[PDB]
Design a binder for these strands. Structure first.
Ligand SMILES: [Zn+2]
Lengths: 120, 159, 60, 242, 141, 347, 131
RNA sequence: UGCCGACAGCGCUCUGGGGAAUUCAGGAGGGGAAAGCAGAUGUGCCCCGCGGCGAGACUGGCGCACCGCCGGACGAGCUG
């Protein structure tokens, strides 16, 4: 079902790294409801979805809206490790990041979404 | 050169600098860097001078984090510009790291010496930052945001 | 007559069904239809007298 | 908000089929929906007691880039009511329904989508609306729906892919009438995401001219969805229809 | 034009696209200078030096006496854009391409095209001055 | 002469220096190799007019010759040697797959109509023939006491296994392959530049000559020229028979193609445009409707013969009118009025 | 199956074929009023909004239908008018809204400044004279 | 968008200007149309010439990844 899964070899690690960057940089919505609201406001730049979840249907409906908006998403394999990367003290299955158009973080995100677009 | 006029103004306005002196100065820095880039392209590929000197300069730039850790080649060394040098200019980091609401408020903060990098408080807002240091920027202990004394206005209002 | 196409008009540049070079852009029609004359005969009578006076001016 | 219940007026816009409804302190855009009375996705709608069967749908720009274009005032959107339109990138079908309501019964729009469950929403709407043909396949291999798509006149495209120009180019090679038309939309961040966007647009339009297209309009849907564009070209002639 | 500001082009960042015009190409061979090298040095960035097909047509249609410069034009390493027009007027060609994109750097030395392309703003002139190239209205270098 | 609009295009980007070698594939319909003065070659597909099919450098000096093999491969002569690449490989390679360097400077190629034979004309007064897959240095045939150089050679396609070649003694030599020996040598007033034989009339040959002249000869009887085409100012660089056998391109050194029937003796057509100073390689396509024109100015041009016939698929009354024009002009092709408006080209 | 037919032989179009049957607009005075409102919608949003300067000499389109904003499925808590809030004509709605106070005040102001000194002032001077 | 509107100006037009009927001469567009005279010779027969299919049988020489190639000339039956 979750066929655009992210592969292991440190690709997930650059993902979690940029998640840490954006979580410090406040460009971040956290939790699935925040993801849906961000993508339905269209501010989202990219969204990461856990696959380690009690049933996957949540991170199956979220790709429906990001497919409805044509903005990228990617399946991390670990909800716990994603929550730790965000710094929540709690596991998170869905984290999204928006755009702020004056940085090089945006260059990083451009690279990352190029990676996931080549994954798809 | 009305384009020169409006372009310099947009530089300052996007990063609230003070005069075209400071803007032209940073441009001069960029000019020296792109001079280096031109020379190291003038030597052909796989040359030893080229290899070591270009590897050096790219390490310099990524050490101050201006050129991205993604792109590490002389093409992008040519392709850098003033917006990027201003990005690693300091006051911008206070604004993009969420202590001062505005770039001008950040300028005032740097004046009255409330932020520090590592140990020492900073007074010059054009103190260039490093990639290795840029997250270690916070208020000092002597500033009422960081603590210490509450401040003179709190002092007088308590008076 | 229909409007010619490309080659047809190109071949018959000098063709015209309406005005000839013997018509002076219908100066007769122009005069009579501004001023309501009833004999284009009489228009031409005015033209011949006008041409006579003009050439008397030329010799003058 | 132009809240629910406000009496408004509707008039034709410039384009054949779309309508513009003005009122009070806020105007907007609508279409006469073919399927009566029913909403699709919580879109707002409009009823007029004609002197029952007369219903329009408000068209959010920010959800549908064709609507962004109709607000941006395109030169000629090529889609008359009653025209054959290959849509491309038909994700969940909202905009597609709008094009359906444009072309009406005597028109037909071929809605192609890549993924599945956005397909499910699309085909649900394809059951309901009797002029939009669901096609769920890989857009890169149009010989798969070569069985379904006849020669059409208008090509919508809103995919966000690097090979987008070649996608719509072979789809032009396969499914576009002599003197054809197309609207596509482009994002800088998905064609090449470091460059300046105008330069990216010029690269894409030069590509289509290498695909033998005649570029004939461009706009930038500026206050609505940053650094995108809508581009209008004509297939293999300088004039549009015939 | 989007990506523009009050007669400044935020658009043209490196690399730069530079249009060759016919007077310019004749004169830079006549001054015996390497095209890509001198442009890269005068701008201090990377380029690509395109030639409209109209310009290529003009420099063939000129007499055989410019055949060397025509060869230099004819070189394969530099990209090309076709045109849709009638009858090979290069100046009209370039000004139309700039006018519909405003992403370029035009290069000439004819005073006519210099005037014509200052008359529309935000687009930079490049020209030779008997030793080297010279930019006119670019804010960067 | 409203519609006498010859030009139909310029492919590619043009070679960096000028075209001094080109060759059509004669058994497919839309594949052409053109090879530069600058020692590079490439092949275009006709249908995708704009861009290239396959491109590689080939030698040091100016590539004198080029063709295709009857299966798929293509061939390059220059003074450095003879090479063989394969363009339509599914991954491209730049390196050749056959080579030769022995026989001196190789002036031209000639390939078999049906089988895998080819011949290389050198400048040592020698021609030598290979067979593909079964020869190394080929058979070396010449006029047995002769050194003077051999510019070109065309395999006959009427009677296969036959060869003619030009020599710089203002002289031509007919050859055979069954009986491996030259056959005959004719000496004329001034030199000859490129040979051909007619692809329908087997004894009929034609030579392109520094007499500024196209001479129609016949192999059995060299007593008289069958036809004299006295059609130029500068010396003719190329000839090609139309596959109809009824038409002929004579491509000058100067800025002039002239097009011909077999039986005029004069100019039916003159073609040029000033972007093309000195035409070199001037050959027909497989419909005998569209000619190709490799210039000095670095260009491959795609032109038309009978320059006022707008092709496609006509309507019945259209072809009625066209051939009606043909017949009427045929009847009245002598009177002063129609005659002068007929022969008045621009020059 | 085949019968006798009926012969039925006894201007500008009335329902536009290429816009799904929009009828020709009936000229009723409240409709005229609504049209005047939507043209002068600039001054209605006094101070807070501005509008695209729609400027023809006429203002009446040939084809228009008065309708109803139906419903917000995603939102109906406050984007829904109340029963008292619902109005027949758009003009009565913008009447029954607030700020018509500020309208009236601007009205007295503009009225005074066009009654600056034109005739009443001259009469009162004339009284100060004749006294 | 109500009528009425003096001078002083601008705009067109003037065999005055409208409105309606009606004849004709043109134009431009849209929809429909199998819209198709690329060279037009009665059938049937067998025979000749020549051509394809086509069962089957061979043969030459090559083949240092060895697994296969490429080429000739005979040929029952069928066909143009
Ligand atoms: Zn042009």
């Amino acid at each position: 079902a979750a066929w655009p899964k992210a592969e292991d070899p440190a690709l997930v690690q650059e993902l979690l790294d940029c998640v840490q960057q954006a979580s410090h940089y406040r460009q971040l919505k956290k939790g699935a409801n925040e993801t849906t609201k961000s993508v339905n406001r269209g501010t989202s730049e990219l969204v990461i979805l856990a696959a380690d979840t009690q049933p996957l249907s949540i991170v199956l409906h979220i790709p429906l809206i990001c497919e409805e908006k044509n903005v990228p998403y990617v399946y991390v394999p670990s909800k716990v490790a994603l929550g730790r990367a965000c710094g929540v003290s709690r596991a998170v299955i869905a984290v999204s990041l928006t755009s702020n158009e004056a940085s090089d973080l945006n260059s990083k995100i451009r690279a990352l979404r190029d990676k996931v677009e080549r994954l798809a | 050169e009305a384009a020169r006029l409006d372009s310099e103004l947009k530089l300052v306005g996007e990063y609230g600098l003070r005069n075209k002196r400071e803007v032209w100065r940073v441009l001069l820095t960029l000019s020296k860097i792109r001079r280096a880039a031109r020379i190291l392209l003038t030597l052909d590929e796989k040359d030893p001078k080229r290899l070591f000197e270009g590897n050096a300069l790219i390490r310099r730039l990524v050490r101050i984090g201006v050129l991205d850790e993604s792109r590490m080649k002389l093409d992008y060394v040519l392709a850098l510009k003033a917006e990027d040098f201003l990005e690693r200019r300091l006051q911008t980091l206070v604004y993009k790291l969420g202590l001062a609401k505005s770039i001008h408020h950040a300028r005032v903060l740097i004046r009255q010496r409330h932020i520090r990098v590592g140990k020492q408080i900073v007074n010059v807002p054009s103190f260039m930052v490093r990639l290795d240091s840029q997250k270690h920027i916070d208020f000092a202990l002597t500033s009422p945001f960081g603590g210490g004394r509450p401040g003179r206005v709190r002092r007088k209002k308590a008076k | 007559v229909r409007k010619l196409k490309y080659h047809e008009q190109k071949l018959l540049k000098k063709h015209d069904f309406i005005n000839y070079k013997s018509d002076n852009n219908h100066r007769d029609h122009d005069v009579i239809r501004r001023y309501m004359i009833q004999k284009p005969e009489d228009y031409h009578k005015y033209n011949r007298l006008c041409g006579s006076l003009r050439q008397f001016a030329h010799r003058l | 908000g132009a809240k629910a219940g406000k009496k408004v007026i509707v008039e034709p816009h410039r384009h054949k089929g779309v309508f513009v409804a003005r009122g009070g302190k806020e105007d907007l855009l609508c279409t006469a929906n073919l399927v009566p009375g029913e909403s699709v996705y919580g879109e707002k709608r409009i009823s007029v007691e004609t002197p029952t069967k007369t219903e329009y749908r408000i068209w959010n720009p920010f959800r549908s880039k064709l609507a962004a274009g109709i607000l941006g005032g395109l030169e000629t959107i090529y889609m008359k009511p009653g025209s054959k339109v290959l849509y491309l990138g038909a994700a969940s079908g909202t905009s597609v329904s709008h094009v359906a309501d444009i072309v009406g019964p005597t028109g037909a729009v071929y809605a192609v989508e890549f993924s599945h469950r956005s397909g499910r929403d699309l085909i649900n709407m394809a059951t309901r609306r009797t002029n939009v043909i669901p096609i769920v396949e890989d857009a890169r291999k149009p010989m798969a729906y070569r069985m379904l798509v006849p020669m059409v006149d208008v090509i919508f495209a809103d995919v966000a892919q690097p090979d987008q120009a070649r996608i719509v180019g072979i789809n032009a090679r396969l499914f576009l009438k002599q003197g054809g038309g197309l609207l596509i939309s482009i994002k800088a961040s998905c064609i090449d995401s470091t460059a300046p966007p105008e330069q990216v647009f010029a690269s894409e339009v030069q590509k289509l001219r290498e695909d033998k297209f005649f570029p004939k309009e461009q706009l930038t849907l500026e206050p609505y969805e940053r650094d995108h564009a809508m581009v209008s070209c004509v297939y293999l002639q300088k004039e549009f229809e015939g | 034009p989007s990506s523009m500001f009050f007669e400044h082009n935020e658009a043209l960042v490196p690399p730069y696209n530079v249009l060759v015009d016919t007077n310019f190409l004749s004169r830079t061979v006549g001054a015996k200078l390497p095209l890509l090298e001198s442009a890269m040095d005068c701008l201090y960035a990377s380029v690509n030096i395109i030639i409209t097909s109209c310009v290529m047509a003009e420099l063939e249609k000129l007499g055989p006496r410019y055949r060397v410069a025509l060869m230099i034009a004819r070189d394969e390493r530099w990209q090309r854009l076709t045109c849709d027009h009638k009858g090979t007027y290069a100046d009209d060609c370039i000004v139309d391409r700039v006018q519909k994109h405003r992403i370029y750097i035009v290069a000439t030395n004819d005073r006519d095209l210099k005037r014509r392309i200052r008359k529309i703003p935000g687009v930079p002139i490049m020209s030779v001055q008997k030793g080297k190239y010279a930019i006119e209205r670019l804010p960067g270098a | 002469r409203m519609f006498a609009k010859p030009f139909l295009g310029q492919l590619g980007n043009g070679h960096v220096q000028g075209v001094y070698s080109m060759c059509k594939d004669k058994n497919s319909l839309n594949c052409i190799a053109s090879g530069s003065g600058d020692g590079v070659v490439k092949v275009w597909d006709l249908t995708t007019r704009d861009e290239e099919t396959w491109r590689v450098a080939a030698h040091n000096n100016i590539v004198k010759g080029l063709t295709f093999t009857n299966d798929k491969k293509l061939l390059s002569c220059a003074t450095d040697g003879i090479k063989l690449w394969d363009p339509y490989a599914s991954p491209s390679n730049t390196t050749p797959i056959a080579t030769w360097q022995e026989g001196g400077p190789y002036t031209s190629l000639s390939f078999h109509r049906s089988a895998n034979t080819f011949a290389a004309s050198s400048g040592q007064g020698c021609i030598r023939i290979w067979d593909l897959e079964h020869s190394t240095a080929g058979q070396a045939i010449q006029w047995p006491s002769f050194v003077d150089t051999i510019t070109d050679v065309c395999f006959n396609q009427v009677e296969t296994s036959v060869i003619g070649s030009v020599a710089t003694d203002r002289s031509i030599i007919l050859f055979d392959l069954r009986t491996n020996m030259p056959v005959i040598k004719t000496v004329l007033h001034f030199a000859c530049n490129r040979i051909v034989f007619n692809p329908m009339e087997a004894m009929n040959l034609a030579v392109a000559s520094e007499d500024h002249n196209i001479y129609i000869f016949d192999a059995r009887n060299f007593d008289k020229a069958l036809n004299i085409q006295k059609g130029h100012v500068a010396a003719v660089m190329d000839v090609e028979f139309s596959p109809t056998g009824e038409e002929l391109v004579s491509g000058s050194y100067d800025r002039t193609i002239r097009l011909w029937r077999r039986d005029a003796g004069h100019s039916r057509d003159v073609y040029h445009t000033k972007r093309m100073q000195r035409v070199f390689r001037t050959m027909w396509t497989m419909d005998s409707k569209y000619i190709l024109t490799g210039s000095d100015d670095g260009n491959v041009r795609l032109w038309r013969a009978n320059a006022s016939e707008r092709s496609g698929v006509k309507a019945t009354r259209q072809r009625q009118a066209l051939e009606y024009n043909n017949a009427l002009l045929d009847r009245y092709g002598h009177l002063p009025e129609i005659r002068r408006i007929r022969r008045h080209r621009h020059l | 199956e085949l019968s006798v037919r009926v012969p039925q032989l006894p201007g500008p179009p009335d329902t536009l074929s290429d816009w799904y049957n929009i009828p020709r607009t009936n000229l009723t005075p409240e409709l005229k009023r609504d049209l005047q409102l939507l043209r002068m919608r600039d001054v209605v949003a006094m101070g807070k909004q501005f509008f695209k300067k729609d400027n023809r000499k006429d203002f009446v389109p040939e084809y228009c239908q008065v309708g109803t904003i139906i419903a917000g499925a995603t939102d109906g808590v406050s984007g829904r008018l109340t029963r008292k809030e619902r109005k027949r004509t758009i003009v009565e709605e913008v009447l029954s809204s607030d700020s018509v106070s500020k309208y009236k005040r601007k009205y007295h102001e503009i009225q005074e400044h066009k009654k600056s000194g034109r005739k009443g002032y001259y009469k009162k001077l004339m009284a100060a004279r004749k006294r």
